[PDB]
Amino acid sequence: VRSLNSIVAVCQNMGIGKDGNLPWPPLRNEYKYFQRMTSTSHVEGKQNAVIMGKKTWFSIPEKNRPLKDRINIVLSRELKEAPKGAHYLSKSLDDALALLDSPELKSKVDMVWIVGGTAVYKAAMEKPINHRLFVTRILHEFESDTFFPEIDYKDFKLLTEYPGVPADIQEEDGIQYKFEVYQKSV
Ligand SMILES: NC(=O)c1ccc[n+]([C@@H]2O[C@H](COP(=O)([O-])OP(=O)(O)OC[C@H]3O[C@@H](n4cnc5c(N)ncnc54)[C@H](OP(=O)(O)O)[C@@H]3O)[C@@H](O)[C@H]2O)c1
Ligand SMILES: C[C@H](O)[C@H](O)C1=Nc2c(nc(N)[nH]c2=O)NC1
Ligand SMILES: [Ca+2]
Ligand SMILES: [Hg+2]
């Protein structure tokens, strides 16, 4: 795989979840941004792949599984088989990337997105491969029990602009947030 993509929404203390879900009530617009980004491939006949950890997979309402129009791969060292509705199950990010390269997929997959949680983002972050990080910064503090790993500001340079990412601070339900994109070039 040529380059990875990661997408996350974080709050002021870099928290990404609490009690198995998101720390804020629903942000319609933020959610549509995540959907659009992860779903949109730029090659007819291909779909994007999404990789996620176990807790994250189970965090999605059962009836909404798997993420429509994307190949859902879950990582777990415990499961023997793919949870009902996941497309594939993998033992490490490595196994995941290797799978992605296999012939069956290679031709079926455009973009690879990492959608968390902590350990997955971390793993993806340390891979010395080209990587773009789509972070949504919610300018408010909510109680969180889970957090986003530390971004190496030395490796990941913040772009000042990116095609199709609103520039200004957004507001919805009285909350302000901003879209950022960081890039690591290998
Ligand atoms: N705000 C956001 O953008 C965002 C994005 C994602 C998730 N969330 C939130 O974060 C929480 C879920 O995240 P989390 O970090 O706690 O859980 P997680 O990363 O989704 O899941 C943990 C499990 O996944 C498997 N796993 C994780 N990384 C692995 C690796 N490299 N290789 C193999 N298996 C690996 C392991 O399963 P086994 O124990 O079976 O080995 C590990 O116990 C929920 O609150 C969710 O709502 C928020
Ligand atoms: C996929 C599952 O909803 C997971 O919690 C994620 N949520 C979000 C995400 N990325 C953003 N920007 N927003 C979300 O709400 N990445 C993953
Ligand atoms: Ca476990
Ligand atoms: Hg927070």
Contact status, residue 1 vs residue 73, Cβ threshold 8 Å: no
Residues 6+ apart with CB under 8 A from 13: 141, 144, 147
Contact status, residue 181 vs residue 162, Cβ threshold 8 Å: yes
Resolution value in angstroms: 2.4
Give, as one character, the DSSP assignment of residue 116. -
What superfamily would CATH give domain 1-186? Dihydrofolate Reductase, subunit A (3.40.430.10)
| Distance in Å, CA 34 to ligand 2 centroid | 6
- Token reading at 46: 């291909």
The best mutation among 76, 121, 135, 145 to test binding of ligand 1, ranked by most ligand atoms within 8 Å of the C-beta, falls on 76
The rounded Cα 59 to chain-centroid distance in angstroms is: 14
Contact status, residue 86 vs residue 73, Cβ threshold 8 Å: yes
Residue 57 burial (10 A CB sphere; 0-12, 13-18, 19+) = buried
Number of helices followed by number of strands (H, E) in the chain? 5, 11
The two beta strands, 109-114 and 47-53, are parallel
Please report, in range form, the residues annotated as the binding site for NADP(+): 9, 15-21, 54-56, 76-78, 116-123
The rounded Cα 170 to chain-centroid distance in angstroms is: 20
